[PDB]
Amino acid sequence: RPRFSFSIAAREGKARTGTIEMKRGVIRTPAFMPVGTAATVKALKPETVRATGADIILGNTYHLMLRPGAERIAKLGGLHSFMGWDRPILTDSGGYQVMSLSTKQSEEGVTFKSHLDGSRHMLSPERSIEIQHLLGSDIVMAFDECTPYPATPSRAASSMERSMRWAKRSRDAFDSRKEQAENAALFGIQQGSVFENLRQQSADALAEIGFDGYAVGGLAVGEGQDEMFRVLDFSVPMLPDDKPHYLMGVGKPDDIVGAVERGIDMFDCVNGQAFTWDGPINIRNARFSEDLKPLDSECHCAVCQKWSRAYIHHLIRAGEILGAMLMTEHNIAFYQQLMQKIRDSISEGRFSQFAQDFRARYFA
Amino acid sequence: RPRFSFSIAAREGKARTGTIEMKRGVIRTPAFMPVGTAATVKALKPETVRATGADIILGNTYHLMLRPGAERIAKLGGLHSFMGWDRPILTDSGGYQVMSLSTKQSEEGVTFKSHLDGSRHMLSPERSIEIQHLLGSDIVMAFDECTPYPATPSRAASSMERSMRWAKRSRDAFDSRKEQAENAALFGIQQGSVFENLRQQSADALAEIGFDGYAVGGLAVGEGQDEMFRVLDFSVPMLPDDKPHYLMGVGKPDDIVGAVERGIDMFDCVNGQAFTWDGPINIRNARFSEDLKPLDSECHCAVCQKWSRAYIHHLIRAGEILGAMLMTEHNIAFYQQLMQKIRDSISEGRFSQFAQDFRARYFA
Ligand SMILES: Nc1ccc2nc(N)nc(O)c2c1
Ligand SMILES: Nc1ccc2nc(N)nc(O)c2c1
Ligand SMILES: [Zn+2]
Ligand SMILES: [Zn+2]
């Protein structure tokens, strides 16, 4: 396969369906990427993650740089070999988590203390790109400065401007490393909060630099679905049409459906909540103690073929690890089934109808 | 298959190897039974438990009667259907756990408060047998009164005597329930602490009543391996030779090898400790942070084929659920491989040699 090749096979309105070909495998879009925090998708073996239908997973520069360490993972042979996942891996730049879990900020980057050992680290565009290389990331995310919501026009502009400067530094760092530039891909991140003029400026700067994909950052940070959808309405069209559009940190089923309707191709997002086509349910609720039905009536995942709500209800309330294993496999499988239905409906020119039917039942 | 049929295929000294045929499947002996606490073998899907080589698992009357409840499990279709394990299941009587986790004792039974909700329960030989029936247990354990170590001759005798009276009540309760007597098996439990005359009295009383199997209870309660082996030396020969001998709660690898050398056919027993043919290791130790080798050099389990000590080291220190999943699958697989080597060596008349080689390396 090539280093990177995004091809759109079908369209309906702003929605698109296709594939991203990379050296380690093919990614079907729209795609949902399970998230791996500490070099593991919570409670699932990689083979199980693959079994649910995932084509790619997400890794975090922040968590990994702290534990077990980027240099260590490199010495060990890379993240893929380390955790046992041989398909594509997209790694975030770390910036987002540093401002949420660990901080001295400057134009050079960010310095902070680990929320684990209390040690210090100076994350910068250059160091972020290097760490993702050490991990062996397939899709590298530019290092940016997220803008907290709400944000004043002035502050949103300053952060967007810095991010574009950092985007240029990320691009140059990536291209200067021969092995990384020839085998991996680099995605730029659009910022600008909820302001259209800033989003336009960010998109233009990003397209001028040139990236393999474009992510819409700064959303899903407390603005609500209505506002998010409004921002996506004018933001996504600003990005290059022939490259993937990645909405960072968005995962609620209805959010995904609405985002795909607005041009998004990639998603990622991180208990007793189980998704069903009839809306989510909390398995801990007493009404499920003797319910012999599976989590969802049509879901084809292994959990729904073998265990009842009553059993999983018992496991979760008992704090048993198998409870988490089963709930997680079903939920990730549900998400993949959702992406499959989306891809098929777009391919058959009936996505709008699918969106309508989905919402009618999901919120009924 | 028949309700119950134990056949010995080979022998060497006091060691035996053979099979126990039951309606739900065949059990190869010597056998190791993984333990299921709350209707689940910690962090493993039943298929994974089976994959490691287990022919039967153990369930607990105490934990299940508290959560989710015996009556509830029955209404739900039985423990097998509930947890998804269709092979044989041996259930303990609950008495042991009540005196360790939850108490008013009498000749009629024991009353106690749950260490969960604080509710009350009156476990008796009759209620214990009934609960195991409600669960759908294949091998039912008689309800006894364990003797704390150390125990005075007087107290050991009183408890042994009560246990034999309770053993008779267990037998009658079992036989009176048509469905249970025709489809399940009942094991009696020998008591008597470390005293030979009491063990002999217990064995005689048990054989007089008649059981499908005989367990050696009251050991592995703080007496040490030397003392335990000394008690087994004269205790096991007292039991009927043509029925299975079950050593309750004994699981350290060296303990199992020594017990089989003394006539035991069945075992069961309940972190970063990983077993290896070179002795156990604690994966949390810093010396494993960059060790690319598998947990054990020859173990054929899935964990050892796919992940390194370095990765599992990371997972466990990070508190990740996959860490527990992988460590548990390997350990249970190790135990099953140990039982297989024991069965094969006995069948080939070279068990004594195997025991010698095992110890030499395990403790080297
Ligand atoms: N809602 C999100 C989630 C993750 C993000 N990661 C980066 N690097 N930047 C953003 O703006 C994000 C927004
Ligand atoms: N070491 C053990 C473990 C479990 C036991 N269970 C019962 N019912 N009775 C004993 O004596 C036990 C001893
Ligand atoms: Zn499911
Ligand atoms: Zn292993």
Strand, coil or helix: B124 = coil
The helix-helix angle for B225-235 and B253-260 (nearest 10°) equals 20
Q: Exposed, middle or buried, A78 (CB in 10 Å: 0-12/13-18/19+)?
A: middle
CB pairs under 8 A between A and B: 88
Integer Cα distance of B122 and B167 in angstroms: 17
Cβ count within 10 A of residue B226: 9
Residue type, B111: T
Task: Say whether B59 sits in a helix, a strand or coil.
Answer: strand
With an 8 Å Cβ cutoff, is B116 touching chain A?
no
Q: Look at ligand 2, atom 8, and give the residue with the nearest C-alpha.
A: B96
Q: Give whole-number Cα distances, A265 to A22, A35, A225, A260, B150, in Å.
A: 16, 16, 18, 6, 69
Q: Is A217 in the pocket of ligand 1 (CB under 6 A)?
A: yes
Pick from B264, B234, B236, B240: nearest CA to B251: B264
Residues linked to residue A266 through DSSP beta bridges, in sequence order: A31, A246
Residue A35 has what DSSP assignment?
Answer: B
Breaks (C-N over 2.5 A) in chain A follow: 102, 270
Ligand with the closest atom to the CA of A336: 3
> Contact A13/A1 with Cβ under 8 angstroms?
no
Collect all residues of chain A within an 8 Å Cβ-Cβ radius of residue B39.
311, 314-315
Q: Is B274 helix (H, G, I), strand (E, B) or coil?
A: strand
Nearest-neighbour CA in chain B from A296: distance (Å): 17
Interatomic CA distance for residues A97 and B279, integer angstroms: 41
Number of other residues whose CB lies within 10 A of the CB of residue B227? 14
- Tell me the C-alpha distance between A186 and A143, whole Å: 11
Pairwise CA distance, residues B347 & B357, whole Å: 17
Of A128, A122, A108, A129, nearest to A176 by C-alpha is: A129
Residue ranges and CATH numbers for the domains of chain B are 1-364 (3.20.20.105)
**Residue B268 annotated in active site:** yes
> Cα A284 from chain centroid?
27
Dihedral angle over CA of A107, A108, A113, A116, nearest 10: 110
For B336-360, letters b (16+ CB in 10 Å) and e give bbbbebbbebbeeeebeebbeebee
Residue A327: which residues within 8 A CB-CB, separation 6 or more?
Answer: A271, A272, A274, A283, A303, A312, A316
Contact status, residue A148 vs residue A221, Cβ threshold 8 Å: yes
* Whether B278 is catalytic: no
Say if ligand 2 is within 6 A of residue B212 CB.
Answer: no
Give, for B28, the enclosing helix (H) or strand (E): strand B25-29
Residue B119 structure tokens: 């509710």
Pick from B40, B311, B320: CB nearest A320: B40
Cα–Cα distance list, B242 to B1, B5, B6, B198 (Å): 19, 10, 8, 22
From CA A253, how far away is CA A275, in angstroms rounded?
9
List residues in chain B that are followed by a break over 2.5 Å (C to N). 102, 270
- DSSP secondary structure code for residue B35 in this structure: B
Q: What is the Cα–Cα distance from B253 to B95, expressed in whole angstroms?
A: 26
Q: Are A105 and A125 in contact (CB under 8 A)?
A: no
Structural determination approach: X-ray
In this structure, are residues B295 and B274 in contact, taking their beta carbons and an 8 Å threshold?
Answer: yes
Looking at the DSSP bridge assignments, the partners of residue A141 are A187
Q: Which residue has the tokens 């994966």?
A: B283
C-alpha to C-alpha distance for A235 and A287, rounded to whole angstroms: 44
- Closest to B286 in 3D by CA, of B310, B268, B254: B310
Number of C-beta neighbours around residue B157 at 10 A: 20
Assigned token pair, A129: 């790109």
Q: Is A72 close to B307, i.e. CB distance below 8 A? A: no
CA distance B90 to A71: 49
Name the nearest CA neighbour of B151 among B227, B246, B249. B227
Give Cα separations from A73 to A29, A56, A292 (angstroms): 29, 19, 44
Instruction: Give the helix ranges, DSSP H, for chain A.
Output: 46-51, 61-66, 70-75, 79-83, 95-101, 125-135, 153-176, 178-183, 196-209, 225-235, 253-260, 302-306, 309-317, 321-347, 351-362
Ligand nearest, relative to CA of residue B338 = 4
**A121 appears as a binding residue in the annotation:** no
Structure token digits, residue A156: 């949103």
Q: Which atom of ligand 2 is nearest to the CA of B142?
A: 8
Distance, in Å, from the CA atom of A266 to the CA atom of A187, rounded to the nearest integer, reads 12
**Would you say B67 and A289 are in contact if contact means Cβ atoms under 8 Å apart?**
no
| Whole-number Å distance between alpha carbons of B203 and B199 | 6
Contact assignment for A325 to B324 by CB distance below 8 Å = no
Q: In what order do the strands lie in the sheet with B120-123?
A: B104-105, B110-113, B120-123
Answer whether A293 touches B (CB < 8 Å): no
Residue A100 alpha carbon to ligand 1 centre in Å:
11
Give the mutation target among A33, A90, A91, A96 for probing the ligand 1 site: most ligand atoms within 8 A of CB.
A96
Nearest atom within ligand 1 for CA of residue A92: 8
Distance CA A50, CA A27 (A): 12
Q: Best mutation site among B37, B42, B45 for testing chain A: the one with the most A CBs within 10 Å? A: B45
Residue B75, chain A, CB below 8 Å: the answer is yes
* Contacts with B62 from chain A: Cβ below 8 Å: none
Say which residues have a Cβ less than 8 Å from residue B353's Cβ, sequence separation at least 6.
B345
Mutate to test the pocket of ligand 2, among B245, B248, B270 (most ligand atoms within 8 A of CB): B248
